[PDB]
Amino acid sequence: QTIQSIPQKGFFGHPRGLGVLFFVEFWERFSYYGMRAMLIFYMYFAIHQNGLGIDKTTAMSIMSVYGALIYMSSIPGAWIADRITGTRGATLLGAVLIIIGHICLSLPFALFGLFSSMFFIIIGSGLMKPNISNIVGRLYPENDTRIDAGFVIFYMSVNLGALISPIILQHFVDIRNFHGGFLLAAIGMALGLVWYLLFNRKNLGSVGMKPTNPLSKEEKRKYGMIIGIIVAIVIVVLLVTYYTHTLSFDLISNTVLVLGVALPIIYFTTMLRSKDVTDGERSRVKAFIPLFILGMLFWSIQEQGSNVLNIYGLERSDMQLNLFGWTTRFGEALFQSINPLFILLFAPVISMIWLKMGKKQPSLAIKFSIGTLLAGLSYILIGLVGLGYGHTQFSVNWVILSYVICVIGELCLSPTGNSAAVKLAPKAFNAQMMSVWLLTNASAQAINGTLVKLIKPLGQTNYFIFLGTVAIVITLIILVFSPKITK
Ligand SMILES: NCC(=O)CCC(=O)O
């Protein structure tokens, strides 16, 4: 028994190990969202401002493609833990790779430093993200009802790190000390790794020390050749295009765009064509197709707050917060703190609205439709402000109001999708259903990598109105099938 080897109390009424992983996940998410908040400005700011001087659209595309690959890397990363290392080994290995990637950005390696950093953080996040979360659930016995509250505490560390790191790193953006700020994130991640190394054995015991489905001798040869050949094809294609001077980021963004649209098709088709899925379960998988489209439309607009809305605010607004006499300069990195702050303050509030309803509360489709409509309206709001003011500089309050309307939509959509990924999941395809709910974000980010290229031809203001309209009309179309989709 893995439960007999660990403490069952010790961290606010939950296993002591939830305390070790809260500290690790806080420091890892602190360094991730800190690095991310700075990265967009580090890329497109001029060389004389200590940036890389990359074209605005290419910097926006790198941000969205980087985010897509982090979520896609969870899929092979969960597999490596399930079949090769176990969840403990993948977490430790993944954490070490994330540290290397942050150190890559602290060094004066310009573009080599940027892409080698992304490479290490993509692989490391894939190995750490799904497996640290798996260990949290395995700390609880089969019939223990504390598990849901345990994850509510676990995901507080995620939003706490996301809130605090842009506030701390705004100083490094202001003085243009990008390397200094990226070293702070590397030191932040090092605290999380040292804490795991000091307290993982006595608090996590034997949980996750070995893979659940180990590979047989023949499978090590089979999967080794297939993976070996895929890693060999990617290396040569990138090397031949580099030395012939025909390698651009368009190669990476187009490959990831294909993966973003191909992966959801492969997963849905497998679950529908399987013989280990009942007629009742097959109808729920069919009913999650329009919900997947709504989730994708939601995450498309929400994730654009890290590379489109913030640059627009920095370039077109006054960047002067002004609320009931409280006026101060609004730092560009602090746009990334609005979303995690409102989740911390209003996630338990919206949770009590549904708990004081029970049967009165709306369906999964109505919650997914409310969320996508609010995300669509947030882009209509800022688009109409740009259209109304034109060349005139408007208040940063309008940009903040856009982020606030989008986070309110996330409070309706994000928890519903987590519950849908487990309730609508077939008995044999639980891990595959967690991948489709995860892919609503990855697919949206893969589309965003190419969707940002429409900003120059359409214009930044029309781009916001077009996306917001597309999101609302498709939501209202899917909303006419709300009684049908409820199965
Ligand atoms: N759970 C993490 C978030 O939702 C925050 C992301 C953001 O800074 O926009």
DSSP letter for each residue of 53-94 = ---HHHHHHHHHHHHHHHHHTHHHHHHHIIIII-HHHHHHHH
C-alpha 126 – ligand 1 centre gap (Å):
18
Partners of 322 in the β-ladder = 327
- Report the C-alpha gap between 387 and 383 in whole angstroms: 6
Closest-lying ligand 1 atom to the alpha carbon of residue 305: 9
- Report the C-alpha gap between 91 and 131 in whole angstroms: 6
Pairing of strands 320-323, 14-15: unpaired
- Ligand 1, pocket-test mutation among 33, 164, 303, most atoms within 8 A of CB: 33
- Report the C-alpha gap between 346 and 95 in whole angstroms: 31
What single-letter amino acid sits at 439?
Answer: L
Residue 327 phi, psi dihedral angles, 5° rounding: -130, 130
Residue 54 phi, psi dihedral angles, 5° rounding: -75, 150
Q: For 214, which DSSP code?
A: P
- Report the C-alpha gap between 410 and 464 in whole angstroms: 19
- Report the C-alpha gap between 141 and 4 in whole angstroms: 10
> Looking at ligand 1, which residue's alpha carbon is closest to its atom 5?
340
Q: For 210, which DSSP code?
A: S
C-alpha 37 – ligand 1 centre gap (Å):
11
**Secondary structure of residue 322 in the 3-state scheme:** strand
Number of other residues whose CB lies within 10 A of the CB of residue 405? 18
Whats the size of the chain, residue-wise? 487
Element (H, E) at 38: helix 16-44
- What Cα–Cα distance (Å) separates residue 271 from each residue in 43, 213, 220, 431, 437? 41, 20, 26, 11, 14
- Report the C-alpha gap between 68 and 429 in whole angstroms: 23
- Report the C-alpha gap between 192 and 123 in whole angstroms: 18
> Looking at ligand 1, which residue's alpha carbon is closest to its atom 3?
340
Q: For 480, which DSSP code?
A: T
Pairing of strands 10-11, 326-329: unpaired
343-380 residues labelled b (16+ CB within 10 A) or e (exposed): beeebeeeeeeeeeeeeeeeebbbbbbbbbbbbbbbbb
C-alpha 219 – ligand 1 centre gap (Å):
39
Sign of CA dihedral 293, 297, 299, 303: positive
Q: Which two tokens stand for residue 382?
A: 């800022």
- Report the C-alpha gap between 67 and 306 in whole angstroms: 10
Number of other residues whose CB lies within 10 A of the CB of residue 433? 21
Q: For 394, which DSSP code?
A: B
- Whether residue 45 contacts residue 173, with contact meaning beta carbons closer than 8 Å, is answered with no
1-487 is a CATH 3.30.950.10 domain: no
Picking from 383, 347, 353, 392, the residue whose alpha carbon sits closest to that of residue 468 is 383
Solved by what technique?
Answer: X-ray
CA angle centred on 168, ends 343 and 350, rounded to 5°:
5
Resolution value (Å, 1 decimal): 2.5
**Secondary structure of residue 323 in the 3-state scheme:** strand
Partners of 328 in the β-ladder = 321
Closest-lying ligand 1 atom to the alpha carbon of residue 337: 8
Helix pair angle (178-204, 16-44), 10° resolution? 160
- Residues whose CB is less than 8 angstroms from the CB of residue 49 and which lie 6 or more positions away in sequence, other chains included: 176
- Residues whose CB is less than 8 angstroms from the CB of residue 47 and which lie 6 or more positions away in sequence, other chains included: 53
- Report the C-alpha gap between 478 and 294 in whole angstroms: 8
**Secondary structure of residue 330 in the 3-state scheme:** coil
Residue ranges of alpha helices (H) inside 390-454 are 397-423, 430-451
C-alpha 187 – ligand 1 centre gap (Å):
21
Element (H, E) at 19: helix 16-44
> Looking at ligand 1, which residue's alpha carbon is closest to its atom 2?
159
- In the chain, % helix, strand, coil (3-state, to 5) comes to 80, 5, 20
**Secondary structure of residue 128 in the 3-state scheme:** helix
- Report the C-alpha gap between 442 and 439 in whole angstroms: 5
- Report the C-alpha gap between 199 and 195 in whole angstroms: 6
- Report the C-alpha gap between 26 and 24 in whole angstroms: 6
The pocket around ligand 1, CB under 6 angstroms, is made up of 33, 158-159, 162, 305, 336, 339-340, 343
Q: For tokens 């009309």, name the residue.
A: 473
- Report the C-alpha gap between 322 and 127 in whole angstroms: 43
Number of other residues whose CB lies within 10 A of the CB of residue 174? 12
Domain boundaries, the chain: 1-487
Number of other residues whose CB lies within 10 A of the CB of residue 144? 14
- Residues whose CB is less than 8 angstroms from the CB of residue 368 and which lie 6 or more positions away in sequence, other chains included: 291, 294, 295, 298, 412, 413, 416, 417
Q: Which two tokens stand for residue 428?
A: 């044999």
Pairing of strands 10-11, 320-323: unpaired
Closest-lying ligand 1 atom to the alpha carbon of residue 29: 2
**Secondary structure of residue 208 in the 3-state scheme:** coil
